[PDB]
Structures are given as C-alpha cells and as structure tokens.
Coordinates of C-alpha atoms in Angstrom, one line a residue:
Chain A
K195 CA -72.4 105.2 51.1
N196 CA -73.8 102.1 52.7
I197 CA -74.2 98.7 50.9
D198 CA -75.9 96.2 53.2
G199 CA -74.3 97.6 56.3
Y200 CA -70.8 97.7 54.8
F201 CA -69.8 101.3 55.5
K202 CA -66.7 102.8 53.9
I203 CA -64.8 106.1 54.3
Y204 CA -63.5 107.9 51.2
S205 CA -61.1 110.9 51.7
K206 CA -59.1 113.3 49.6
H207 CA -56.8 116.2 50.6
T208 CA -55.8 118.8 48.0
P209 CA -55.2 122.6 48.2
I210 CA -57.4 125.1 46.4
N211 CA -57.9 128.9 46.3
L212 CA -61.4 130.2 46.1
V213 CA -63.7 132.4 48.2
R214 CA -67.3 131.0 48.4
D215 CA -68.1 128.4 45.7
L216 CA -66.5 125.0 45.0
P217 CA -63.9 124.4 42.3
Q218 CA -65.4 123.1 39.1
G219 CA -62.5 120.7 38.3
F220 CA -61.9 117.0 38.5
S221 CA -60.4 115.1 41.5
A222 CA -60.5 111.4 42.5
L223 CA -60.8 110.1 46.1
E224 CA -58.9 107.5 48.2
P225 CA -60.4 105.0 50.7
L226 CA -58.9 105.3 54.1
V227 CA -60.9 103.4 56.8
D228 CA -63.1 100.4 56.2
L229 CA -65.8 99.8 58.8
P230 CA -67.7 96.6 58.4
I231 CA -70.3 97.3 61.0
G232 CA -73.5 95.8 59.6
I233 CA -76.2 98.3 60.7
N234 CA -78.7 100.5 58.8
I235 CA -78.2 104.2 58.7
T236 CA -81.1 106.5 57.7
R237 CA -80.1 110.0 59.0
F238 CA -76.9 111.9 59.5
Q239 CA -75.6 115.2 60.9
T240 CA -72.7 117.5 60.2
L241 CA -70.4 118.3 63.1
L242 CA -69.4 122.0 63.5
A243 CA -67.3 123.9 66.0
Chain B
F486 CA -84.4 91.2 111.5
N487 CA -84.7 89.3 108.2
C488 CA -82.4 91.9 106.6
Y489 CA -79.1 90.5 105.5
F490 CA -76.4 91.9 103.2
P491 CA -76.6 89.9 100.0
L492 CA -73.1 90.7 98.7
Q493 CA -71.2 88.4 101.0
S494 CA -67.4 88.1 101.0
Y495 CA -65.4 85.1 99.9
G496 CA -62.7 83.4 101.9
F497 CA -59.2 82.9 100.5
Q498 CA -56.6 81.3 102.8
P499 CA -53.7 79.0 101.8
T500 CA -54.1 76.8 104.9
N501 CA -57.7 75.9 104.1
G502 CA -59.1 73.2 101.8
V503 CA -59.4 73.1 98.0
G504 CA -62.9 74.6 98.0
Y505 CA -61.6 78.0 99.2
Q506 CA -58.9 78.3 96.6
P507 CA -59.4 81.1 94.0
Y508 CA -59.9 80.0 90.4
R509 CA -59.7 82.5 87.5
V510 CA -62.6 81.4 85.1
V511 CA -62.7 82.9 81.6
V512 CA -65.9 82.3 79.6
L513 CA -65.8 82.9 75.9
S514 CA -69.1 83.7 74.2
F515 CA -69.6 83.2 70.4
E516 CA -72.7 84.3 68.5
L517 CA -73.6 85.0 64.8
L518 CA -75.4 88.0 63.4
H519 CA -75.8 89.7 60.0
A520 CA -72.4 91.3 60.4
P521 CA -69.6 89.7 58.3
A522 CA -66.8 87.6 59.8
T523 CA -64.1 89.8 61.3
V524 CA -62.2 87.3 63.5
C525 CA -59.2 85.5 62.0
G526 CA -56.8 82.8 63.1
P527 CA -56.8 80.1 60.4
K528 CA -55.0 82.6 58.2
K529 CA -51.8 80.7 57.7
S530 CA -49.2 82.0 55.1
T531 CA -46.2 80.1 53.8
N532 CA -43.0 81.1 51.9
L533 CA -43.5 82.4 48.3
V534 CA -42.0 80.5 45.4

C-alpha cells in the first residue's frame, strides 16, 4: 500500500501443500522493511525468471 | 590558433607559496521536500530509572 508516499513492506513465510489454487485459511503478516520515500506510485509489475 | 585545452592542471609544490597549497573543501547541501525527516543526531538517550 502507499499512504502519502510512506511505502511499507509486509511479508509472511509459511509452508503449504496444494497444487493450483490458494489455501482458504487464515494467516497474518509481519512488516519487514519500512521505506519512507515520499513518491507517488500508480503502476507496478511482477518480476519473473 | 585560438584553441586551448580548457581543463588546465593545478600546481602543488611544498616550496611554493600559500596559494598553491591543496585544500580539501567539503560543501554540505541541505534542502526540504515532501519526504519526512530521516536524518537524526539530536536523539540523545540517558540512563533508565
């Protein structure tokens, strides 16, 4: 998310076991890196290998 | 003719005058933008009671 240029990073690591779909359970997240940049972000792109 | 190299070289000799002595000048620039304050320095902490 982005609140007036204050960008935050939320992450979570947990093992699952499925094939195609996502698990329909409940899991919280943990903030890792705070980046107070102060810019406006309108687009994004997912990096693949 | 009328074509001189603009990047002239300095002169640093210990036997010359004071004007040819090298000085390391550091210029610190400070500006304000919409980004929040990230620099610290007055953050002084004391012993806990």
